[PDB]
């Protein structure tokens, strides 16, 4: 086998994402995806990736795998309500959004409330 | 180990420097050979004034991997933050040198200062 360092993969993707360099981002994250395929914390930075390149479905399903890799990671809820409001589901990114911030530290709280104030503007009956 | 550099890269994103400091040091103890682990830890360090523990972290990356821009870099700043500026042109070239080019810019600017205070 190719016997890969997905550590590094992982890391050079982080640098990928912090340059703005998103497809790259996405690349190193995939590679590192195949030698470590249960970190909610890979599948939550590449949903991210994702959604900053307005691959919304791609982010939604990557941050849905980060919630069944561990639902109690904030991030993991956070990406997929933000991608969901993207894809004009705002039923279902209100519950991943409360979800978020029940999980997240009190840093983050204050992000996701927003989100929710902007996903609560455009529900209606 | 891997865990903890993830824990340590979400609290060094969300400004919380002390506790990435804390959770790099423990994946550090874990795995000392990595230069992006040494990185982060010396960009943590020097975002809470930790001057010259940044530079030995940015130090031990450049000789884990010195072709990695980013350590030469981390050092260069810490470097000037201490009033070494010698040293720091010296880093500060080698990261030019080794940059992407979208780094470029930070290290032109970096250099400017640098030589401000020099020469």
Redesign the interface.
């Given at each position: 086998s190719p016997n890969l360092d997905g550590?590094?993969l992982?890391?050079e993707g982080?640098?990928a994402f912090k340059?703005?360099?998103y497809h790259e981002a996405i690349r190193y994250y995939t590679q590192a995806i195949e030698v470590?395929p249960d970190?909610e914390?890979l599948y939550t930075n590449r949903s991210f990736a994702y959604f900053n390149i307005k691959e919304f479905e791609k982010s939604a399903a990557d941050a849905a795998k980060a919630v069944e890799i561990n639902a109690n990671f904030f991030?993991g809820h956070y990406r997929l309500g933000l991608a969901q409001m993207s894809l004009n589901d705002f039923g279902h990114a209100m519950e991943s959004l409360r979800k978020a911030w029940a999980l997240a530290?009190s840093?983050?709280k204050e992000a996701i409330r927003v989100a929710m104030a902007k996903c609560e503007s455009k529900m209606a009956r």
């Open positions: 550590t590094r992982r890391e982080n640098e340059a703005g360099r470590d970190s914390f991030k530290p840093e983050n």
